[PDB]
């Protein structure tokens, strides 16, 4: 498993921001407040926690413009043919990918706009191509993405 | 204001139930969502509207004009209304328990011709169907039973939704229209009908058009209006484009000064005097859409290849064989933009197949075009159409059409060219300017008119095709005489602006 690239299609202070990723990412630079808001972005997507509270009000590029956040993660799910770590990759979703030879997985992210009930319902939707994504299956408060990926958050 | 203005403003402010019967096309919609906008915000209740379409991509243009909204309206195809609001909560209760809640509905493989043996389909094999004729409808007259039958499932459509605006309703067969009216019957639902009495109907065989004129002859309880839609902005453009001859010349109010029409050119020296109205009067915006309408397509690439000197980089987009007006044009235009853009999505193809609703049964026709990939001109054209022909019913709507669809992708690029970006400084010819409006417009008068001195459609769409500001230009001296004669004979001589 390997992290391919991540686009945050918006947020509090990024546009058309995309980044490639890898395993042991590193960020650095001058603008704290945009390493603290990729930070909040992987948290956004990967953890429940601040899941749970959804988006609020300032956390839009600006304040009124442009009501819709997407933030996408790609995967890269398959393996070496040599190696069998390519089914136990996969098997803990079924229908997402509806092709065996697949190798690109995507994480998405959707935010409703704040003018009515001032509340931003995030909702998480997977699947191995860009078009007609499926709803990620949550039979109560925990999804099916909360049993895959475990966040530990570390800051002294 | 003229027929314009009051027939918005008699339609914002009803209560009832209204029968729009408006133009062929040219903004129908622009209605359908300023009433929905101003029927939501006066209403703080907690009932929601529901909007109901034919096509599914008329259902996101009306989505996009709209918003979002977290009221629960439902736009979308009709369909999608009574799958999801009827049948599928209230099969358990109103038809037995032992009737399943889940199901996929295709309408690609039944053809059966009853009504007993249509439940069947749904008890047995958890599978949909449809009737065998096409003026009839099961799912919608599955919708009407239930509804009869049970009482939570009336309950429910009344107490949620306030008023269901309706969309093309000409062709519309008889099982549809009897839903529609149970609703206003008993259960006191208002309704909102949009569409064009006769003239020409196409879109979802089986059309029957006296379910439509007839509400309109014998029909009370009902609001009628006229021809409704403002296809064109403002009222110093209307004036002119009211003119043609005579009739609706006793309709035209003239004022003392005129403000959208500038005629300021006697020599024409092109780049000099268009590039003035930009600069020196700043009438021309570059960076809204700039649309030329001129015919003879040759003197149009002459423009072209004179300003491609200058640097306006002009663009003209011809007469295609498929722009003859035929009930297939709609589809077929789509079906070109998914093989020829190179990268173009299947699900924007799939959003135009009538009813649509389509899940899993996109991937049987992607195969179907995904073998017109290949160039192949000779013998895979007439085959591999003909099998996606079968596939969505509406057969034998071809020969004529079949070989105008070969003409356009004749060795495989007609020129090269087609309406697949998005690019300004457009050309259009009269063959191919019908249907779509355009924002600003130097067609400097539309000469070459004053030998027939008939044939009055031709200067209405010249006219008309524009929306708020237009330029008529004193070039031609027959022209002129042609219009000193709807001088006198107008009452009101103004029609040039002069302090």
Same mark, same amino acid.
């Given at each position: 498993?390997?992290? *391919?690239?991540?686009? #945050?299609?918006? &947020?509090?202070?990024? +546009?058309?921001?995309?980044?490639?990723?890898?395993?042991?990412?590193?960020?650095?630079?001058?603008?704290?407040?945009?390493?603290?808001?990729?930070?909040?972005?992987?948290?956004?997507?990967?953890?429940?926690?601040?899941?749970?509270?959804?988006?609020?009000? *300032?956390?839009?590029?600006?304040?009124?413009?442009?009501?819709? #956040?997407?933030?996408?993660?790609?995967?890269?799910? *398959?393996?070496?043919?040599?190696? +069998?770590?390519?089914?136990?990759?996969?098997?803990?979703?079924?229908?997402?990918?509806?092709?065996?030879?697949?190798?690109? &997985?995507?994480?998405?992210? +959707?935010?409703?706009?704040?003018?009515?009930?001032?509340?931003?319902? #995030?909702?998480?939707?997977?699947? *191995? +191509?860009?078009?007609?994504? #499926?709803?990620?299956?949550?039979?109560?408060?925990?999804?099916?993405?909360?049993?895959?990926?475990?966040?530990?958050?570390?800051?002294? | 204001?003229?027929?314009?203005?009051?027939? !918005?403003?008699?339609?914002? =402010?009803?209560?009832?139930?209204?029968?729009?019967?408006?133009?062929?096309?040219?903004?129908?919609?622009?209605?359908?969502?300023?009433?929905?906008?101003?029927?939501?915000?006066?209403?703080?209740?907690?009932?929601?509207?529901?909007?109901?379409?034919?096509?599914?991509?008329?259902?996101?243009?009306?989505?996009?004009?709209?918003?979002?909204?977290?009221?629960?309206?439902?736009?979308?195809?009709?369909?999608?209304?009574?799958?999801?609001?009827?049948?599928?909560?209230?099969?358990?209760?109103?038809?037995?328990?032992?009737?399943?809640?889940?199901?996929?509905?295709?309408?690609?493989?039944?053809?059966?011709?009853?009504?007993?043996?249509?439940?069947?389909?749904?008890?047995?094999?958890?599978?949909?169907? %449809?009737?065998?004729?096409?003026?009839?409808?099961?799912?919608?007259?599955?919708?009407?039973?239930?509804?009869?039958?049970?009482?939570?499932?009336?309950?429910?459509?009344?107490?949620?939704?306030?008023?269901?605006?309706?969309? $093309?309703?000409?062709?519309?067969?008889?099982?549809?229209?009897?839903?529609?009216?149970?609703?206003?019957?008993?259960?006191?639902?208002?309704?909102?009908? @949009?569409?064009?009495?006769?003239?020409?109907?196409?879109?979802?065989?089986?059309?029957?058009?006296?379910?439509?004129?007839?509400?309109?002859?014998?029909?009370?309880?009902?609001?009628?209006?006229?021809?409704?839609?403002?296809?064109?902005?403002?009222?110093?453009?209307?004036?002119?484009?009211?003119?043609?001859?005579?009739?609706? !010349?006793?309709?035209?109010?003239?004022?003392?000064?005129?403000?959208?029409?500038?005629?300021?050119?006697?020599?024409?020296?092109?780049?000099?005097?268009?590039?003035?109205?930009?600069?020196? =009067?700043? @009438?021309?915006?570059?960076?809204?859409?700039?649309?030329?309408?001129? !015919?003879?397509?040759?003197?149009?690439?002459?423009?072209?290849?004179?300003?491609?000197?200058?640097?306006?980089?002009?663009?003209?987009?011809?007469?295609?064989?498929?722009?003859?007006?035929?009930?297939?044009?709609?589809?077929?235009? $789509?079906?070109?933009?998914?093989?020829?853009?190179?990268?173009?999505?299947?699900?924007?193809?799939?959003?135009?197949?009538?009813?649509?609703?389509?899940?899993?049964?996109?991937?049987?026709?992607?195969?179907?075009?995904?073998?017109?990939?290949?160039?192949?001109?000779?013998? @895979?054209?007439?085959?591999?159409?003909?099998?996606?022909?079968?596939?969505?019913?509406?057969?034998?709507?071809?020969?004529?059409?079949?070989?105008?669809?070969?003409?356009?992708?004749?060795?495989?690029?007609?020129?090269?060219?087609?309406?697949?970006?998005?690019?300004?400084?457009?050309?259009?010819?009269?063959?191919?300017?019908?249907?779509?409006?355009?924002?600003?417009?130097?067609?400097?008068?539309?000469?070459?008119?004053?030998?027939?001195?008939?044939?009055?459609?031709?200067?209405? @769409?010249? %006219? %008309?095709?524009?929306?708020?500001?237009?330029?008529?230009?004193?070039?031609? =001296?027959?022209?002129?005489?042609?219009?000193?004669?709807?001088?006198?004979?107008?009452?009101?001589?103004?029609?040039?602006?002069?302090?």
């Amino acid at each position: 498993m390997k992290f *391919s690239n991540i686009t #945050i299609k918006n &947020f509090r202070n990024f +546009e058309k921001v995309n980044i490639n990723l890898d395993n042991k990412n590193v960020i650095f630079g001058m603008n704290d407040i945009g390493k603290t808001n990729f930070l909040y972005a992987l948290r956004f997507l990967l953890d429940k926690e601040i899941r749970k509270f959804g988006f609020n009000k *300032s956390d839009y590029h600006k304040h009124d413009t442009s009501k819709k #956040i997407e933030i996408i993660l790609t995967l890269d799910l *398959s393996n070496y043919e040599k190696d +069998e770590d390519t089914k136990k990759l996969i098997s803990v979703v079924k229908g997402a990918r509806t092709s065996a030879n697949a190798d690109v &997985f995507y994480i998405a992210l +959707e935010s409703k706009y704040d003018d009515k009930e001032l509340y931003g319902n #995030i909702i998480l939707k997977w699947g *191995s +191509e860009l078009d007609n994504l #499926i709803d990620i299956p949550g039979r109560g408060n925990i999804n099916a993405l909360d049993n895959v990926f475990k966040v530990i958050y570390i800051n002294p | 204001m003229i027929e314009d203005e009051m027939s !918005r403003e008699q339609i914002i =402010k009803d209560g009832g139930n209204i029968l729009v019967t408006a133009g062929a096309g040219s903004g129908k919609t622009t209605i359908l969502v300023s009433k929905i906008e101003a029927d939501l915000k006066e209403n703080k209740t907690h009932y929601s509207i529901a909007a109901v379409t034919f096509t599914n991509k008329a259902a996101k243009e009306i989505e996009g004009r709209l918003g979002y909204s977290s009221r629960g309206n439902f736009i979308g195809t009709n369909d999608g209304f009574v799958e999801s609001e009827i049948i599928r909560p209230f099969i358990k209760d109103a038809f037995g328990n032992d009737y399943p809640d889940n199901f996929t509905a295709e309408y690609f493989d039944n053809q059966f011709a009853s009504y007993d043996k249509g439940l069947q389909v749904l008890k047995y094999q958890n599978i949909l169907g %449809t009737y065998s004729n096409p003026k009839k409808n099961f799912k919608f007259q599955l919708a009407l039973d239930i509804l009869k039958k049970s009482l939570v499932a009336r309950q429910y459509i009344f107490s949620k939704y306030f008023k269901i605006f309706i969309d $093309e309703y000409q062709d519309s067969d008889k099982d549809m229209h009897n839903l529609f009216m149970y609703l206003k019957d008993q259960l006191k639902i208002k309704l909102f009908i @949009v569409g064009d009495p006769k003239q020409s109907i196409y879109i979802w065989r089986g059309a029957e058009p006296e379910n439509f004129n007839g509400l309109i002859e014998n029909s009370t309880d009902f609001n009628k209006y006229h021809l409704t839609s403002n296809f064109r902005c403002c009222q110093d453009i209307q004036n002119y484009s009211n003119l043609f001859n005579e009739e609706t !010349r006793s309709l035209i109010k003239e004022k003392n000064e005129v403000q959208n029409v500038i005629s300021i050119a006697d020599d024409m020296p092109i780049s000099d005097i268009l590039l003035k109205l930009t600069e020196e =009067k700043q @009438v021309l915006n570059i960076e809204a859409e700039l649309v030329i309408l001129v !015919r003879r397509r040759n003197q149009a690439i002459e423009i072209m290849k004179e300003l491609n000197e200058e640097g306006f980089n002009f663009i003209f987009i011809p007469q295609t064989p498929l722009d003859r007006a035929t009930p297939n044009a709609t589809l077929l235009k $789509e079906v070109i933009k998914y093989v020829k853009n190179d990268r173009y999505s299947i699900y924007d193809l799939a959003a135009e197949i009538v009813g649509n609703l389509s899940s899993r049964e996109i991937k049987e026709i992607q195969k179907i075009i995904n073998e017109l990939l290949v160039p192949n001109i000779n013998q @895979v054209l007439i085959n591999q159409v003909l099998i996606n022909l079968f596939a969505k019913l509406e057969i034998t709507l071809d020969t004529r059409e079949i070989t105008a669809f070969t003409e356009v992708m004749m060795t495989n690029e007609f020129d090269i060219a087609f309406d697949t970006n998005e690019y300004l400084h457009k050309i259009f010819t009269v063959h191919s300017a019908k249907g779509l409006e355009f924002n600003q417009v130097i067609i400097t008068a539309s000469d070459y008119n004053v030998h027939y001195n008939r044939d009055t459609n031709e200067h209405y @769409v010249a %006219t %008309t095709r524009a929306k708020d500001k237009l330029i008529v230009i004193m070039d031609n =001296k027959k022209y002129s005489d042609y219009i000193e004669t709807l001088m006198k004979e107008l009452k009101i001589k103004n029609i040039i602006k002069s302090i």
